[PDB]
Every structure is written in C-alpha cells, then in structure tokens.
Write a protein that binds this ligand. Structure first.
Ligand SMILES: CCCCCCCCCCCCCCCCCC(=O)OC[C@H](COP(=O)([O-])OCC(O)COP(=O)([O-])OC[C@@H](COC(=O)CCCCCCCCCCCCCCCCC)OC(=O)CCCCCCCCCCCCCCCCC)OC(=O)CCCCCCCCCCCCCCCCC
Ligand SMILES: CCCCCCCC/C=C/CCCCCCCC(=O)OC[C@H](COP(=O)(O)OCCN)OC(=O)CCCCCCC/C=C/CCCCCCCC
Ligand SMILES: *P(=O)(O)OCC(C)(C)[C@H](O)C(=O)NCCC(=O)NCCSC(=O)CCCCCCCCCCCCC
Ligand SMILES: CC(C)NC(=N)NC(=N)Nc1ccc(Cl)cc1
Ligand code: SF4
Ligand code: SF4
Ligand code: SF4
Ligand code: SF4
Ligand code: FES
Ligand SMILES: [Mg+2]
Ligand SMILES: [Zn+2]
Lengths: 112, 176, 96, 208, 114, 215, 97, 103, 230, 124
C-alpha cells in the first residue's frame, strides 16, 4: 500500500504477514536443535513467540507495526532474517559451554 | 520532530507538464540565476581599503606578546614560572636569580613565537598581569630568528604598546 | 644604566655582554643588539620611600585588581624599611 | 538541590545492569566480566577469541540491535602481560543505547578481524595495526594508514619516544629529502606534576 | 609455553615464507631501480636486500618471523605499487649520515657516548 | 535577522539549477543498511533516510529545551544531502533565535575553585583562591580514574572522545573518533560506477576535513 | 545604503526581493565599540555560611564501576538495553519543503 | 590539499578508489597524553577546524562527565548558542566549497 | 600481644601503644598532618590530624592518640572532613598571599593539603598579620610571615642537633618562632630545618628564586663528601 | 596451539635502533619520597627510566639541546616482576633497586614528660 518505506534500498513487501510467519517458523524450528538448558534458546524462543502471536492476531498493518514497536514492517522482516542467520551461526558456534579461559591475575585492574 | 526535503511528486496535469516543458526549453531557472548575479553586481562591495582601513577588533584580541611594568617603572614579572607551567606549546623559557637588591626577578625570559599558538593561557595565569598579548598583529619578519623574542624584545614591546595594552586591560578586566 | 662593555657592546640589565674572544658577537655585525634602555632596578631605586603611621601596612601595587596580590608588611625593625616584594616598594614608620 | 554535582539516572543504571546480566547469561563461554559505570556506561570484558561471536550476537540479536560501530581503538598498558586492550564501541539506534566491549591481546597474538561484522572495522583495524602493532588475522588489506612510508616502530606504544628516532630535512648534496637521527634544538621539558597526596579515597588500592 | 600460531606451526614453514619473500624481493630490485630512476646499481640493491634479511637471522621464535615477513611483504607492496618515492628507497641506504666510528679511542675523542 | 535572505540567495543559484541537479542527483547513492554498517552518522544517515539525530535522541547541555526539525532525505544522494544541509542551516537559525530569547542570567563557570579557576580579584585578595589558581595553572585538577566515551552531534556527524584517566592530572589515553574517517573509508563504496567528476562531487558531499581524519 | 533610486529598482527587480530591508552591510545598527563597565553576578557557592565543601564536592562522589557479573564468583523475561525509541512525528511547522 | 587518491579507471568509469590518508598526521593523541587536561583543549580546538567550538564542547562534556560536575545553566545556553553558530559556519563552508569544486 | 583495631571497617592488628596515624599507615591511609614528623617528638598542636572514632562524640588527634581495642577509625567521615576544613581555614586565614614569590610554591604541604582536604573559598574579611623576619645565618633565609607555628624546627633543633637556641617567644596570636637574640643558628645539620619546614618560612638561601620543583629532574645518587655515604 | 620455549624477544619488532637497544642501561626503581613534602602517594609504583645522556647549550638563545630520544621516557609498572619482564622482552640492559619502606617506629607523647629519662623535652 505504502509508496516507499522511507529508507534507501528497503523495498516494500506486498505480503508482510506471510513473510513474518515464515521467518518466525524458520527461527523457531532452528532453535529446536539448541539444548533446552541453553540461556540463548529460552530468550529468543520467548521473544519470537511473543512477536509471532501479534502477527497472527493482527490483520491491520499499521496496528501490527504499532504493537511490534520495531519500526516499519519491512524493518521487522529484515530483523527477523538477521535473527535467523544469527541463530544458525550460534548453533554453529555453540556459545553455551563454560568459559574458555579466565584472564590473568591482574588483567582488568584499573588504575594501574 | 522531522521533515522531508525531497519527497514531493510533481503533478502530471497538462498545465504543469507544459510549464515544465517550457522550463526545459526556455531556461527559466538559468535566467533567474543570471538575475540574482546581476543584482549582486549592482550591490555595493564589502571590501575595506587596507592598509588605510582596518577590520574591527576587540579588547580581548590576542596578538604580539609583551611584558608590562608598574607605574613606578619596576617590571611586573616576579619570576614565578606559571608561564612555563601552563604554556601548552612550551614556548616560554624562564631563568631567574636574586637581583642586586634582592628582588625575585627574571634573568632570562624567552618566547618562541614560531612555537606559540597564541592561546592566551599565559596572561590568565599571571598573578601580577606582567605578560600580556598585545593588540599588534603585523609583526611579520623576513627571518626565522627574528621571531625568537627575548626579555629585551618583550620589554620593548611592552613599552611600545603600553598605552593601548593598558586601555584594553582597563576596558576588559571586569570580565576576568 | 646602560653601560658599554670593553668590546664596545652595550650591557643589558642582567649583566649580559659577550667576551672579547666570543665568536657570538658576529651576529650583531651589520645589525643591532636589542637592549632595553629603562632599568627597573634603577627606576625603583629612584622611587621614594613612603612613610605611614602603622606597624603593619598593606600593599596591592595600586589599581586594585590591576596590581599584585595584597600583602601586609611589618614596619617594626627600624634598621631597614619594609619592602613589598611584588612591586619592590619601600615603606617606613616615622622615627624623628 | 546541588548545582555543581552531575545528576544520576538510576533507571538507566538498572536497565544497563539488567542488559549486562542478560548478555552474560546468553554468552557464558566468552563473557568474562560485566561492569556498569556510575555515569551509565555498560562494559563487557570478553575473551579475545570470542570477538566475532559476541559482535555478531550484539549486532543481529532482536533485543540487542547494535547496528552501528561507533569506534574501535586500543590502549597500551605495559604493566599487564597482555598490554594491548582492544575496545569496541557499539551503538543501538533501535533502543537508543551504547555498549562497550573489551578484549586483551599481547604483541604476538593475532585477533580475528571484524570486517565481516562491521565495515568500519577495516580502516579502524588498519589504524590499530599501524599505531600499536596489533595484528588482525582475516583482514582484506592490512597495511600502514597514517604513518609515513617505511616508518619503523609503532608510535602509540608507551615505550616509543614522543619525538621519534628520525627527522626529515632537505639535503642539497643529494637533491632530495633525507632521514637523519633526531636532534632537538630545545629538549622537551618533562614536568613532574603528580601531587604526593591521595585525592580520591574511593579508588584507594590495597596496601599490598 | 603454549601459544597460538600466526602463520607457521614450526620453524620450517617460517623459513619457507622467508625464502618466498626473499625471492619476491630479489625479482623486484631491477624494476624498483628502473621505476624510481635510482643512481644505485642492481647489485647494490640485491646486497642491501641481503643485508636487511641477514640482520634478523638470529630470530628463533616462529611468531616473530611471521610478523617480520608480514612487514616485509607490506614494504614490498608499497614499493611495487610505487606508493613510496625515491626518498624512502634512498632512506634505506644511509647516505648523508657521517660514518660513526666503532673504536674506543675514537668514541673517547668525539664525546661521552658509549 | 539578515541571514535568511542569504540562504535564499544561495538556494536561488543551486537548488533548482538543472546543472547542479545533473551534477548531484543520483550520485553517491548509499542505502540505509550499508551506510549504517560502514559506520555512517549524521547527514549521511539523514540523507539515506534514517531518522537518527544525537541532539534529539541523546540530548546534551540544554538541547532538550529547544524546538527544531530534523531534515530527512529520500534518495540518499548528493542533492538530498545538500537539501538536508540547507534545512539544517535554517533549523540552526531557529535554535539561535530561541537561545537569544531564552538566555538566562547567572555565572558562566562552575562555582568549584578546585576545577574552575577563581576570578582574578578573588585570587588577588584571597589565600584559598590564590592557592587554587596556582595549583590549577601549574599542576591541573585531578580526574578520578575511569574511562568514558562521549559523542556529540557535530556538524559533520557523530564526533566522539574516548578518554581514559588513571587518576592523575593528565589523561592516560585519548581516542578521537571523527565522523569523516568512516565516510572517507566508505568513499570507495560510494564511487562505484561513476567518473572523476562524480568522485569529486562525492568527496564534496562527504565533507571531509583531513585534520580530523588524520589527527 | 547610498545607491540611486533607479539602481535600487533594478537590483530589487533582478533579485526579486526587496534588498533594502536586508542589507549585507552594517550601517550604525551594531552595538557601540565602547560599552559601560559590567557587574557580573556570583555563583551559588558564594555564601558565608552553610557552604562546606564536603557537601558540594562532585569529584569525591565518583565511584568505581559496579561489578554486575564476574567469572571468578523461575523463568526470567528477556530484556533490552532500553525501551524502544518512539517513532518521530512529522513536524507541523513545515512537513515538506 | 593533503589528499592522495589512487584510482583505477576503466576508460571513463571508476573501478577502484583508494584514499591515502596520513599526510596531516601529527600525533595529536600522544601529545594529549603528554599534556594535562587544560593544555589539551587547543588540540581539540585544532582537530576539525570548521567546528572548533563543537570539538571544544565535546571534550568539555567528556571531562565534565569524568569529573562528575555540572556547568551552570547560563554556560550551557552559551555553549548551545555558539555550537549552533559553529554549525552555521561549518554548513556554509561545506556547501560553498562543494559548489566551488563544482563550478 | 597485638591488639585489633578497625580502620573504615577493615580489621588490622597493631602493637600496643600504636597511634591512630600509624594504624592508618598500616591500612594504607595517610592522615593529613602539619606538625607531626615520624623522626621527631609528638606535638599535637597543629590539629590537622583530627579523626573521628565510630562512637566517640569528640574527635581525637591521630598523631598522639594510642589506639584502643575494638576502635573503629572513620578517616573519611563527615566530622573528620569538617574538622580538616576548619583547621585549613584558620591556617590559610592567617597565611600571606606569597605563593608566586615563594620557593615552596610547587612543593608546599599547605597548598597540597588545602587542595585535598580543604575548602576552595575564603570568608576571612579582616586584615592579616605581619611578622618581622629573623636572621639565623647565610644558609637559611627566614620569612616568618609564612610560619604556621608548627614547632618542627624547635623539636628538630633540640632533639637532633642538640642546639637549644630556637623557641617560641610571645603568647597568643603574636607567638613567634625565633632565637629572640640575633644569634645565628649554625650547625652541621642546619639545612634539615629547611627540609622539615612544611611552609616557605625556612628556605635555602643559595637556592632562592633559582627554579621550581616541577621543572627539575631528580637523579638518585649518593653523597661523596665524607665516608658516611649518604 | 603450538609450543615454544623462547624468551619473548620483540627487539626486531619494536623498531628501535640497535644502538639504543644495546647501549642503554635502564633503572627499575620506586621513586624516593620528596623530602620537601610529607606525602607518600608518589612512592607506590615502580618506575623505569633510561640513563642520562649529553645535554649541551644551543648557540642561539642558549637553550638546552639534546640528542637522546629516550631522555623523557618514563614507564610506570605495578610490580618489579612486571617491570623486569618488560625490560627483558624489550632487550635493554637494566638494574633493579629494591624498595626502601620506612620501618615502623615507637612514638609516645607521654615520653616527652619523663621522670628520669633523657627524652624529656625542654619546650612545647
Ligand atoms: C590619469 C588620471 C585619470 C583620472 C584623473 C581624475 C579624473 C577626475 C574626474 C572627476 C569627475 C568624474 C568622476 C567619475 C567617477 C570616478 C570615481 C568617483 O569619484 O566615483 C564617485 C563619484 C561620486 O559618487 P558617490 O558620491 O561615491 O556616490 C555613491 C553612490 O553609491 C553612487 O550611486 P550609483 O553608482 O548607483 O549612481 C550612479 C550611477 C547610476 O546609474 C544610473 O542611474 C544609470 C544606470 C545604467 C545601467 C547600465 C550601466 C551599464 C551596465 C553594464 C556594466 C558592465 O550612474 C552611473 O554609473 C553612470 C555614470 C555616467 C555615465 C558613464 C558614461 C561612460 C560609459 C563608458 C563605457 C562606454 C564608453 C564609450 C566611449 C569610448 C571612448 C571614450 O561617482 C561618480 O562620479 C559616478 C558617475 C560617473 C562615472 C564615470 C565612470 C568613468 C567613465 C569613463 C571616464 C574615463 C576613464 C578613463 C579612460 C582612460 C584614460 C587614460
Ligand atoms: C544574445 C541575447 C542574450 C540574452 C540572454 C542572456 C543570457 C542567457 C543565457 C543563459 C543560459 C545559461 C547557459 C545554458 C547552458 C545549458 C543550456 C541547456 O541546458 O539547454 C538544454 C535544453 C534541455 O536540456 P536537458 O533538460 O538537460 O535534457 C533533458 C531532456 N529531457 O535543451 C535545449 O535544447 C534547449 C532548447 C533550445 C531551443 C529552444 C527552442 C524552443 C522551441 C521552438 C519552437 C518554435 C519552432 C518554430 C516554428 C514556429 C511555427 C509557427
Ligand atoms: P637458511 O634457512 O639457513 O637461510 C639463512 C637464514 C639466516 C635466513 C635462516 O633462514 C634463518 O634461520 N633465519 C632466522 C630467522 C629468519 O628467517 N629471519 C628472517 C626474517 S624475515 C625479514 O627480515 C625480511 C624483511 C626484510 C625486508 C628487506 C627490505 C628490502 C630493502 C631493500 C632496500 C633497497 C632495495 C632497492
Ligand atoms: C578541510 C576543510 C575545512 N577545508 C577546505 N579546503 N574545503 C575545500 N573544498 N575548499 C576549497 C577552497 C579553494 C579551492 Cl581553489 C578549492 C577548494
Ligand atoms: S598564548 Fe598560549 S602558547 Fe602562546 S606563550 Fe601564551 S600560554 Fe604559550
Ligand atoms: S605568570 Fe607573570 S609573574 Fe609568572 S613568570 Fe609569567 S609573566 Fe612572570
Ligand atoms: S609557604 Fe606554601 S602556602 Fe605559604 S606562600 Fe609559600 S607556597 Fe604559598
Ligand atoms: S618555621 Fe617552619 S618548621 Fe618552624 S614552626 Fe614555623 S612552620 Fe614549623
Ligand atoms: S599532626 Fe596531629 S595535631 Fe598536628
Ligand atoms: Mg621549607
Ligand atoms: Zn606592592
């Protein structure tokens, strides 16, 4: 409906609800490979479910954008894509293991 | 709040299309620019007739340095080296020893005008208002050496510009 | 008190004068040596001695905020005169 | 009221503390320490090998959209074993916030280049290498950026002299500019300014 | 004791990289002489490259060798792309500096320097 | 009073000129995401369309007590950046008018002689004032140990200082982040598919000061 | 200024605006170069009593940064660095140029 | 005047730009390290010499944040007014020099 | 054996007879002082070392107060800060404005402790006192208007040099340190009164007006004029 | 994670000339307390400084000239071990001086008024 999103290089999406649903589903099913005890998995699943419910319960684009508080719905879609890519990378990185190595005795001491 | 500077779609009606086509074929905006330049040509120039006319200045202006004296003729500097302590560029070199009458007076006071940044910190830190930045700004030299002032040169500058420096300090000493 | 050195060179108020064998006098050839004629020590010696009827006298150099920090001088020792050391000014208590 | 004392924002302090706890819980493998200064600035001290994961998370996470790389610099502290301290300043426009990430590194330890995460990291890491000697492993083009060509040494290290070792002048014999050992007409005057009395009791160190 | 490598796991790879850098510098001396219109000969350039390589022959840590070859590659890149001038190439050859004596008697005569 | 006419005269020569539009339109186009990530701030972001401004998002001094508008571009090119700069000049005129109207009375420096130097009369009549003047102008005030990063909306973008103090009277570390550094780093990105004159125009619209770029 | 009436008409018509009101040159409308002496006010700390420096010392109230998490030493909701920034409102003075 | 640009062109197009900055590097950060806090103010005054008072304001804000002190309201208003004047100066310089380069 | 005291809540074991100032030194805190010197006898007259005990209603002089068991020493307490400000206010109220013309300028314990534990303002609207300068030899220059009557030179003279020629003549605000008669304080250890004087009342005459402490560079060496090897 | 037993020599990387690398003897010491003041806050960190070199007078203006780049170079270290490690890895020669703390002393105000000891003072 909108002529321009207002940002250079950010095209207008004609079907925002379906794209948001697809991206949220792809985020949710990727997180199933992360252990349940991992702190990263719980928070992102919670926020995705909170945002996914808004999309399913709001047909109006403007009201959905107001509820999401993420700016333009195209910006929301781009953020969802970035979140999915980050989820894949973190699945590869596995940043839930204990600390790799503690710093030397006096490393962050200041003033020194 | 915000505003848009270049988001305004031109109308596509025949009147506006004809106006834009006439603007393209007949150089309307170029004629406008020519008219503005012609108006500026017929305006009065803003050039002063230097050196017979001088640009406006202020009592706070910082120029050539000078060392002042008391009305009795005794020099104001007491060799305290706050000059050297506070100078950002380290352009001041001071050496002192007791005078023949026992006074605390300088024997060497050098300012490297090629190293000074004319920031005015030295006259802020003087407890006796000895070192000042005079209003002179036309002290260009033909050699690098002539810009290495010493105590004699600074005292000569102070004696030469004492009247104007005293007037400026009297006019602008209540703001400090 | 501008005095001429043996080499014909003016002596500054700091007792500065290049020696006979000093090569640095060449810089003054075809040019001049910058010397300030007024000597502050001579002028302050020429200045008279103020007499006030008090043991302690305050000096700020004259002009108020345009002078030096205010100091207090004790005029008890009659052998000499109390000298404000910022401006080098002598004060004395009447004796006769 | 106290006109001469800066106001304090407990709400922002608490928000920054909560976000620091959040990121520390999310990334236990790399985050070594979390601090919040009294002027409401969040600092994350991480292991040097977690730079890429931590920056990617802090750039792409939905609640941590720090899309803008504000600055990237290093601090040289000779007394530490890992003298060099790489600092990343990140800006989140979505939440109007700033974060600081800290990493330690010595002379011979390379770091993973962040050009994949942020594009300003290219020139920032080039400058860091030129000025300190810190090497970045996967940099598209790492070379001197600010110093003169053929310059020897890294000026911003605390052991490098202020005036350097060489100076330039025109030599008529060779009809070109030459580099010769530095020799100052007037030596820089080092001033001892530190007072022998402690000024801030709050930062007093144990007597050891 | 145990540290992460930069480029070479051991000294053999570092020596291989040093040989590659030496080959690259050796093949570029005539081009550098021609482009910058230097007054030196190609043999002098080769000898100077050899001398520069031989002043770090006492290095035994592979990481230091890796950093040295990285810096050498950077300097070669600056020379090939003609980013530097004749000034720096001649700065490699100390030509306007007076020959400082290395004997005790001369050092005693000239001044207080050790 | 006599400056809006100057701005209008400037706009009469460039804004609607077809030669200027040819030289500046659709040259150096940068998308919002690329601008951000390359690390852009200020006029570049506003031209690309990002609604960001430090003076309104993170106010400093009394910038939250004045009313002004933030120009926003649409195409992210040299012409949009030029329009944004002109509108910023007009908004700065408005802010100057507001400041002139609402200038308050009082002192001009913090009444803390251990940080700000005392007045000359007090220094020449008070022992504490003289001691504080002496110490401030010889040694300097000590700053508590710490590290800060403060950024402001300078006319060329986000200008930042990262200051590290070790508790002494001299700064231990001082990193200066100039907006022009990132812009000149991103010059190569913006110059793709253009000519020499377009490169000159891109540099001009990036508004690079090499003093702040090099430091 | 001092231009002739015909010249003024020509410059006004060519520029399209009345230039006499807005002159680039300053004609006696600026302040006098000599001003009466001022009397600057004192700050809030110029008090003879109840002005102890221990109650107004900004520097001494600084603290070392508070440790929130250190490696040496009920579900929780996800949190953000700050509440999301509210979208800007289009200016009513002049939304479009 | 202190910019060196290495450009690889394809006939008329520009295929590669490489800015060779560093012709105006002066070691300002190290000099600031060697100075005090008051003596380092002119260094910021000389960093971006079209926004001099803006740089001064940024450095002053950093130092005041470290010191945990607050400027008086009149000082803040003066700083804002002169920052806006300096912004006018900088924008004038930018636009006029852009035009001077382009014609 | 060792008793246990508290400094700012931190426990520390000290020998019996230890003073509050030495306990603070043990815990790393340096109490401000003007009359106290560790190599001289205790005076307790400058009153700059007043500290607050946790439950005591009156502050005590840390330089002369032995610590009791279980005492908590509040070095950075409000009462301690106010007491330090008051003492510094008196000292600077009667001190003269001679800092620029003073050889003690950049290395003065009065200036440093005024900037650390003192106020930044003066409410003294009266006139200051002036004292006639003495003469005690060609090595020590005396400007007695700057003396704070801390009696370090008297105690040093007596105890270390065995010369009982310095003392306080007068009473009240007119009390003056001097030799009364024009005797010159000449000894083999007479420059140490220049060293121990916290103010510029006693200064080196040969070194007068030559330089400032911040300019000079310090080289640590040994003395070669005898076999002591100082 | 390779293994090596070298002594962390960065001499070839620092860029310092071999003259200033091999002919310099630095002093690792805690600065002595200034006798003109009673404060002890400047005697808490170890200092590394180089040996003094020649300083002559400028023929013009009589300024203090120098030719030693490391004349103003002073480094601050928290511990003697850190300072020695830095000196060893930079390759300069060094000499370390042990810290001289003031020993504790027994002070009693009541000793000034003694019945039969010599510590009794003749004045207050
Ligand atoms: C070696 C030494 C030589 C010199 C020795 C000494 C000589 C002393 C002579 C004294 C008497 C004459 C003084 C003349 C002016 C001098 C400057 C002066 O004092 O000015 C202040 C004096 C007093 O004015 P003021 O008190 O300052 O008032 C300030 C106001 O702002 C003013 O307000 P305003 O400016 O708005 O109002 C005036 C304006 C108002 O204007 C109007 O109302 C009309 C508007 C017309 C618009 C279109 C004009 C053109 C547009 C395109 C321009 C490009 O009127 C004019 O400008 C008209 C001028 C008169 C007609 C000019 C005819 C000659 C044209 C030359 C070109 C063609 C030549 C063809 C022949 C060639 C062969 C000979 O001004 C005048 O006298 C101006 C009028 C006269 C101008 C004459 C210009 C020179 C003409 C040529 C003469 C020969 C030159 C040398 C030749 C080579 C010799 C080797
Ligand atoms: C000698 C008297 C001097 C008086 C005038 C004072 C000086 C005025 C000069 C100011 C001009 C400034 C310099 C101009 C340089 C640039 C000129 C220019 O841009 O013109 C190009 C212009 C537009 O180009 P762009 O818009 O950039 O291309 C995009 C196309 N969509 O193209 C042109 O050709 C201009 C038109 C010139 C011819 C105009 C003819 C108008 C139509 C004629 C109709 C009559 C036909 C006759 C038949 C009659 C039947 C009854
Ligand atoms: P074999 O392996 O025995 O080879 C002998 C050496 C001694 C080289 C050994 O390889 C060896 O064990 N060496 C010790 C470690 C090492 O390899 N060091 C070399 C360091 S790499 C290096 O220093 C390269 C940088 C030099 C760049 C020179 C620049 C060229 C200057 C030219 C100026 C004029 C040209 C026109
Ligand atoms: C570094 C900034 C403040 N300075 C300027 N030199 N910008 C610039 N484009 N100004 C300019 C001036 C004259 C000429 Cl011929 C060409 C360009
Ligand atoms: S104006 Fe500034 S730089 Fe120049 S001599 Fe004075 S203090 Fe030094
Ligand atoms: S501040 Fe004044 S009295 Fe002190 S050295 Fe400078 S000119 Fe002399
Ligand atoms: S003794 Fe100290 S306070 Fe007194 S005049 Fe000298 S420097 Fe100033
Ligand atoms: S002369 Fe000095 S040492 Fe003696 S009592 Fe006075 S201040 Fe103390
Ligand atoms: S130091 Fe204790 S009263 Fe003087
Ligand atoms: Mg003394
Ligand atoms: Zn006087």
């Amino acid at each position: 409906l909108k002529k321009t999103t207002g940002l250079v290089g950010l095209a207008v999406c004609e079907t925002p609800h379906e794209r948001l649903k697809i991206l949220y589903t792809k985020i949710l099913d990727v997180l199933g490979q992360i252990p349940k005890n991992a702190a990263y998995r719980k928070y992102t699943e919670q926020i995705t479910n909170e945002k996914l419910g808004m999309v399913k319960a709001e047909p109006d684009v403007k009201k959905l954008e107001e509820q999401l508080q993420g700016g333009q719905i195209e910006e929301v879609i781009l953020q969802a894509e970035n979140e999915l890519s980050l989820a894949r990378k973190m699945l590869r990185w596995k940043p839930w293991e204990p600390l790799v190595e503690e710093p030397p005795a006096n490393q962050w001491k200041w003033p020194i | 709040t915000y505003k848009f500077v270049n988001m305004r779609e031109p109308s596509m009606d025949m009147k506006s299309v004809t106006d834009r086509a006439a603007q393209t074929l007949l150089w309307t905006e170029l004629v406008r620019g020519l008219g503005m330049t012609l108006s500026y040509l017929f305006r009065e120039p803003a050039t002063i007739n230097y050196p017979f006319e001088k640009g406006p200045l202020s009592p706070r202006f910082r120029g050539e340095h000078a060392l002042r004296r008391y009305p009795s003729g005794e020099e104001r500097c007491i060799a305290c080296k706050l000059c050297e302590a506070v100078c950002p560029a380290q352009a001041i070199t001071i050496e002192a020893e007791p005078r023949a009458d026992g006074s605390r007076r300088t024997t060497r006071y050098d300012i490297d005008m090629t190293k000074c940044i004319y920031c005015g910190f030295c006259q802020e830190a003087c407890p006796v208002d000895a070192i000042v930045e005079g209003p002179n700004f036309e002290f260009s030299t033909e050699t690098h050496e002539e810009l290495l002032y010493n105590k004699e040169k600074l005292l000569n500058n102070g004696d030469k510009w004492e009247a104007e420096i005293a007037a400026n300090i009297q006019a602008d000493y209540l703001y400090r | 008190g501008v005095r001429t050195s043996p080499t014909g060179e003016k002596v500054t108020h700091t007792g500065q004068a290049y020696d006979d064998g000093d090569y640095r006098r060449v810089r003054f050839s075809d040019r001049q040596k910058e010397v300030n004629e007024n000597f502050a020590i001579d002028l302050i010696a020429e200045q008279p001695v103020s007499e006030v009827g008090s043991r302690v006298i305050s000096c700020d150099g004259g002009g108020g905020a345009l002078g030096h920090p205010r100091v207090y001088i004790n005029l008890d020792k009659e052998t000499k005169t109390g000298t404000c050391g910022y401006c080098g000014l002598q004060f004395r208590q009447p004796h006769h | 009221t106290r006109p001469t004392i800066r106001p304090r924002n407990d709400v922002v302090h608490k928000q920054l503390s909560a976000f620091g706890q959040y990121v520390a819980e999310i990334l236990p493998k790399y985050v070594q320490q979390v601090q919040v200064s009294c002027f409401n600035e969040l600092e994350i001290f991480i292991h040097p090998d977690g730079v890429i994961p931590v920056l990617t998370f802090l750039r792409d996470h939905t609640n941590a959209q720090f899309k803008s790389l504000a600055d990237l610099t290093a601090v040289d502290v000779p007394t530490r074993q890992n003298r060099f301290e790489i600092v990343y300043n990140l800006l989140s426009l979505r939440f109007n916030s700033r974060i600081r990430v800290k990493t330690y590194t010595d002379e011979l330890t390379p770091i993973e280049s962040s050009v994949t995460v942020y594009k300003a990291a290219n020139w920032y890491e080039r400058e860091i290498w030129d000025m300190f000697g810190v090497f970045f492993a996967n940099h598209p083009d790492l070379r001197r950026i600010l110093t003169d060509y053929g310059f020897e040494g890294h000026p911003f290290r605390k052991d490098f002299p202020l005036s350097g070792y060489v100076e330039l002048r025109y030599d008529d014999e060779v009809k070109r500019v030459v580099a010769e050992p530095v020799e100052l007409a007037q030596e820089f005057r080092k001033f001892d300014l530190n007072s022998p009395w402690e000024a801030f009791p709050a930062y007093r160190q144990p007597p050891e | 004791t145990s540290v992460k490598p930069i480029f070479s796991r051991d000294m053999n790879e570092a020596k291989r990289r040093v040989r590659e850098l030496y080959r690259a510098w050796y093949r570029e001396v005539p081009n550098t002489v021609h482009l910058f219109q230097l007054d030196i000969s190609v043999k002098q350039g080769r000898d100077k490259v050899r001398e520069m390589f031989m002043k770090n022959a006492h290095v035994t840590d592979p990481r230091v060798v890796d950093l040295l070859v990285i810096k050498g590659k950077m300097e070669l890149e600056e020379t090939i792309n003609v980013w530097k001038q004749r000034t720096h190439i001649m700065r490699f050859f100390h030509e306007t500096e007076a020959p400082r004596p290395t004997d005790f008697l001369s050092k005693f005569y000239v001044g207080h320097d050790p | 009073k006599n400056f809006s006419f100057r701005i209008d005269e400037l706009e009469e020569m460039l804004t609607n000129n077809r030669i200027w539009r040819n030289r500046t339109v659709d040259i150096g186009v940068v998308t919002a995401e690329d601008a951000l990530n390359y690390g852009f701030s200020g006029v570049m972001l506003r031209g690309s369309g990002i609604q960001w401004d430090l003076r309104k998002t993170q106010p400093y001094d009394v910038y939250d007590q004045v009313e002004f508008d933030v120009p926003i571009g649409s195409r992210g090119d040299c012409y949009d950046r030029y329009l944004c700069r002109v509108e910023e000049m007009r908004q700065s005129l408005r802010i100057i008018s507001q400041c002139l109207n609402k200038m308050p009375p009082g002192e001009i420096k913090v009444d803390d002689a251990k940080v700000s130097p005392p007045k000359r009369a007090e220094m020449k009549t008070s022992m504490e004032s003289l001691i504080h003047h002496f110490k401030l102008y010889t040694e300097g005030y000590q700053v508590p140990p710490g590290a800060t990063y403060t950024a402001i909306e300078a006319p060329k973008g986000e200008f930042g200082v990262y200051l590290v103090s070790d508790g002494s009277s001299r700064p231990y570390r001082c990193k200066i982040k100039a907006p022009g550094f990132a812009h000149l780093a991103g010059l190569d990105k913006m110059s793709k598919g253009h000519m020499l004159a377009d490169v000159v125009a891109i540099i001009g619209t990036q508004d690079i000061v090499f003093g702040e770029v090099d430091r | 200024a001092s231009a002739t009436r015909v010249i003024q008409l020509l410059r006004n018509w060519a520029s399209g605006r009345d230039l006499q009101a807005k002159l680039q040159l300053r004609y006696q409308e600026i302040s006098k170069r000599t001003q009466p002496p001022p009397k600057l006010p004192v700050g809030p700390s110029h008090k003879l009593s109840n002005n102890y420096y221990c109650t107004r010392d900004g520097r001494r109230e600084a603290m070392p940064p508070s440790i929130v998490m250190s490696s040496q030493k009920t579900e929780k909701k996800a949190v953000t660095p700050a509440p999301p920034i509210k979208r800007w409102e289009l200016s009513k003075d002049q939304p479009y140029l | 005047g202190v910019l060196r640009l290495v450009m690889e062109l394809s006939g008329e197009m520009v295929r590669k730009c490489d800015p060779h900055i560093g012709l105006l590097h002066r070691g300002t950060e190290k000099l600031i390290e060697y100075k005090t806090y008051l003596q380092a103010l002119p260094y910021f005054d000389r960093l971006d010499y079209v926004s001099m008072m803006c740089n001064e304001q940024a450095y002053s804000l950093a130092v005041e944040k470290l010191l945990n002190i607050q400027p008086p309201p009149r000082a803040q208003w003066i700083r804002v007014l002169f920052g806006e004047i300096t912004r006018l100066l900088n924008h004038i310089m930018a636009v006029t020099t852009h035009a001077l380069d382009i014609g | 054996n060792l008793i246990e005291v508290f400094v700012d809540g931190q426990s520390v074991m000290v020998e019996p007879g230890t003073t509050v100032l030495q306990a603070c030194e043990k815990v790393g805190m340096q109490i401000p002082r003007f009359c106290y010197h560790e190599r001289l006898s205790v005076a307790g007259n400058c009153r700059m070392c007043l500290v607050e005990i946790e439950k005591a209603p009156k502050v005590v002089a840390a330089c002369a107060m032995p610590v009791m068991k279980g005492w908590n020493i509040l070095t950075n307490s409000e009462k301690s800060k106010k007491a330090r400000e008051g003492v510094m206010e008196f000292l600077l109220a009667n001190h003269p404005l001679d800092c620029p013309i003073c050889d003690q300028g950049g290395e003065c314990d009065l200036q440093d402790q005024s900037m650390m534990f003192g106020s930044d303002r003066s409410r003294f609207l009266e006139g200051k006192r002036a004292v006639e300068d003495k003469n005690i030899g060609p090595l020590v220059k005396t400007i007695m208007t700057r003396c704070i009557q801390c009696t370090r030179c008297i105690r040093f003279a007596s105890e270390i040099a065995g010369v009982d020629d310095l003392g306080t003549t007068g009473r009240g605000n007119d009390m003056q340190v001097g030799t009364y008669i024009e005797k010159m304080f000449m000894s083999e250890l007479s420059g140490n009164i220049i060293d121990i004087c916290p103010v510029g009342a006693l200064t080196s005459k040969p070194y007068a007006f030559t330089a400032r402490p911040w300019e000079t560079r310090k080289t640590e060496s040994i003395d070669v004029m005898d076999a002591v090897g100082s | 994670l390779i293994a090596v037993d070298e002594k962390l020599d960065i001499t070839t990387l620092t860029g310092v000339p071999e003259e200033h690398i091999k002919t310099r003897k630095v002093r690792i010491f805690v600065p002595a307390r200034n006798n003109m003041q009673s404060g002890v806050n400047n005697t808490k960190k170890w200092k590394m400084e180089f040996d003094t070199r020649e300083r002559w007078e400028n023929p013009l203006m009589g300024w203090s000239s120098t030719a030693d780049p490391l004349s103003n170079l002073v480094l601050t270290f928290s511990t003697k071990e850190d300072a020695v490690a830095f000196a060893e890895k930079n390759g300069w020669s060094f000499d370390v001086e042990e810290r001289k703390v003031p020993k504790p002393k027994s002070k009693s105000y009541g000793a000034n008024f003694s019945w039969n000891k010599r510590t009794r003072v003749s004045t207050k």
